[PDB]
């Protein structure tokens, strides 16, 4: 018995076709993805293959002005139109709180929405009851396939789920559900979830009964053979894990932003055991035409978005690199741009002995969501910017001791290599890491720009000295695991809205050209 697993993850409001880098589509002929093109491929597969399942591993929410305006109603509608069979909850599904998930996605979906490691409490228990499920047994031909969801244990620090949602460890929560499914005579079980390639590998290895793991979060690209685009594979497709009970469990992820469609053909024996697994993500390029009906629908919905696509903020003569492969790994010129705008906003004239009250900036790479292309006469529009900073947050002023900030830079890279959001971008700071060192001891050099000086220059960070830092409210609140900031900060003053601060600076500058200049160095 052969099942075809079609899967997406981390679509992040990429409803329309995009450029190769996921930014706004300019030259349509070189454009990729979008729900209208995905529909065409999905329909073609359904016609050729007898047993098909279309799955989403979370993070459909947040990414472009589609989400800013439609707040999840476009997700429900277009996922229903593509006829998804199931969806696991990602972290960004809580960006607008529980209420923003329940309405509209949970109530409007025509497919089950899953987690299992999310437990509601207090008044929420009855309010969310039956709207999300730990698993769902789905009929596929003459057979049944159990799908069991999971969401990152880290979601309370990455999004806004609130206090009445408890995020249990994934492996601990999954084992009883899979065990229960086997007692209800379900022998083919898919683990669909949003926790990251490392966790997916652990689920495959530790949760007895899981036939195949379909993941997300880490934007992991896996491929068998020579890849078709700019993405570099982290491993083969599928990634084979050997379970503690001695079974070969395939692990799959389909990169992000609907560029690729995950495709995995599994051959199962009568007892529900995986005999073989093969496949590859399908590059959704201009060769695959967009569905005319879905395109007409996307266009109907695109009208309410157009009043933000106009007015030029300024120009850039350089490519603004807001790609996660860059910003979550090393110094990125978009990072330097946003930090330069952050410092520029806080220029306050007082005291002869201070050139300015604040010289330092820190920004997590997980906060930078998109690059901006310079090739359409270098124009930067509000829309272009709204894909980079979509969260509607503020850039705040904090008082931090040198030790707190040193701990912050250690956290920044404590698990470097997993494409996690905590990697810090900087302004008025020159940091040097030795990643070959043990976590908690990777910062080898940390120099900061002076404030109590007439000529600003870099001096080494002092542990007992209190420094003023411009930083997003998300980090000030202990987001991305920056608990030491929330706990040890000496003062916290809220500032201006994130997108406004960067638009104002782009407008003041008229023509920008940020470089990667050595603010962050490794070895």
């Amino acid at each position: 018995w052969e099942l075809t697993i079609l899967h997406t993850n981390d679509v992040h409001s990429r409803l329309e076709q995009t450029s190769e880098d996921s930014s706004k589509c300019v030259n349509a002929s070189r454009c990729m993805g979008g729900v209208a093109r995905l529909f065409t491929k999905v329909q073609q597969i359904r016609r050729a293959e007898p047993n098909v399942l279309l799955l989403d591993a979370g993070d459909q929410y947040q990414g472009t002005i589609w989400f800013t305006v439609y707040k999840g109603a476009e997700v429900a509608h277009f996922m229903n139109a593509l006829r998804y069979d199931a969806m696991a909850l990602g972290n960004h599904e809580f960006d607008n709180g529980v209420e923003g998930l329940i309405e509209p996605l949970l109530k409007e979906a025509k497919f089950p929405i899953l987690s299992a490691n999310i437990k509601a409490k207090g008044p929420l228990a009855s309010q969310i009851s039956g709207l999300y499920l730990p698993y769902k047994v789905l009929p596929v031909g003459d057979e049944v396939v159990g799908i069991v969801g999971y969401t990152s244990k880290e979601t309370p620090f990455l999004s806004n789920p609130g206090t009445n949602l408890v995020f249990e460890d994934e492996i601990t929560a999954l084992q009883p559900e899979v065990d229960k499914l086997k007692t209800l005579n379900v022998n083919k079980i898919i683990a669909l979830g949003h926790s990251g390639f490392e966790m997916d590998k652990l689920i495959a290895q530790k949760v007895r009964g899981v036939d195949v793991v379909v993941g997300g979060h880490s934007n992991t690209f896996l491929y068998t053979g020579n890849p078709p685009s700019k993405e570099v594979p982290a491993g083969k497709y599928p990634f084979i894990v050997t379970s503690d009970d001695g079974r070969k469990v395939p692990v799959v992820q389909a990169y992000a932003f609907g560029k690729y469609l995950g495709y995995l053909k599994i051959e199962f024996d009568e007892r529900g055991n995986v005999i073989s697994s093969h496949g590859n993500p399908i590059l959704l390029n201009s060769s695959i035409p967009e569905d005319p009906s879905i395109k007409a629908d996307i266009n109907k919905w695109r009208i309410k978005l157009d009043n933000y696509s106009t007015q030029e903020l300024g120009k850039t003569i350089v490519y603004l690199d807001g790609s996660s492969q860059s910003c979550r790994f090393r110094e990125c010129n978009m990072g330097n741009l946003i930090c330069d705008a952050m410092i520029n906003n806080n220029l306050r004239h007082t005291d002869e002995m201070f050139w300015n009250h604040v010289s330092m900036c820190i920004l997590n790479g997980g906060g930078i969501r998109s690059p901006i292309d310079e090739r359409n006469n270098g124009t930067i529009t509000w829309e272009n910017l709204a894909a980079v900073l979509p969260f509607g947050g503020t850039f705040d002023l904090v008082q931090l001791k040198g030790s707190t900030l040193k701990k912050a830079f250690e956290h920044s890279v404590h698990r470097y290599g997993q494409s996690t959001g905590e990697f810090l971008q900087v302004g008025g700071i020159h940091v040097v890491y030795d990643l070959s060192r043990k976590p908690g001891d990777r910062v080898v050099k940390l120099d900061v720009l002076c404030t109590k000086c007439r000529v600003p220059s870099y001096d080494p960070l002092k542990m007992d000295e209190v420094y003023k830092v411009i930083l997003p409210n998300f980090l000030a609140n202990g987001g991305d695991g920056f608990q030491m900031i929330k706990d040890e900060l000496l003062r916290h003053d809220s500032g201006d809205q994130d997108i406004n601060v960067v638009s104002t600076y782009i407008s003041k500058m008229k023509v920008i050209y940020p470089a990667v200049e050595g603010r962050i160095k490794h070895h």
Partner: antibody
Amino acid sequence: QIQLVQSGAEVKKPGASVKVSCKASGYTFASYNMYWVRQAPGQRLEWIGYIDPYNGGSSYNQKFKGRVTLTRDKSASTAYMELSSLRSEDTAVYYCARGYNNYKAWFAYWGQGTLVTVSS
Amino acid sequence: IQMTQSPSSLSASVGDRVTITCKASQSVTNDVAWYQQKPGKAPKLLIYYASNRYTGVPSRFSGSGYGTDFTFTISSLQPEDIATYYCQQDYSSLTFGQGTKLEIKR
């Protein structure tokens, strides 16, 4: 508060057609499928069909293939059920219903019912 | 898919535990719902996903089962429970049970 209000009782001759209305208030009408079910005296609740009020696409129970037509007026937040070639067997209480969610047919919301009497 | 309800009719005193069954002609997973219907009224949703209780339905009402054999219970029969109860499946298309009329002994 999510209310479904149906057109009143009808009496139709065998051979005639009937069009029952269902006005939805309390939620975005176009965003959820609307179900039509009926209850004939001592016969058990029978599904008629459902419609997606966004595009007017519907799925029907095979028993009424070419007899029932499901439509809607988006601007009026109203769903229509038209049953033609009326037989005495269509003497039933006609209901429009909506799910707790758009996934399953767990009818949390029902219309008051519309009695259609097929007699000469 | 046919949904067959046995007991079909039953009488019980106030405070009693009442159990009614619904049998599906084939496996319906947990895709079963239960409704309460009073004479001149529309049915009220009580239980969905075979065991999940709908919003204001009292804790004395419960459901159980997985594929084929289904159960509905009133753990403390009250005079307001005087109705016909229907089971339903939404696995293949949509079918209902023929009902169970509940009457109370007084």
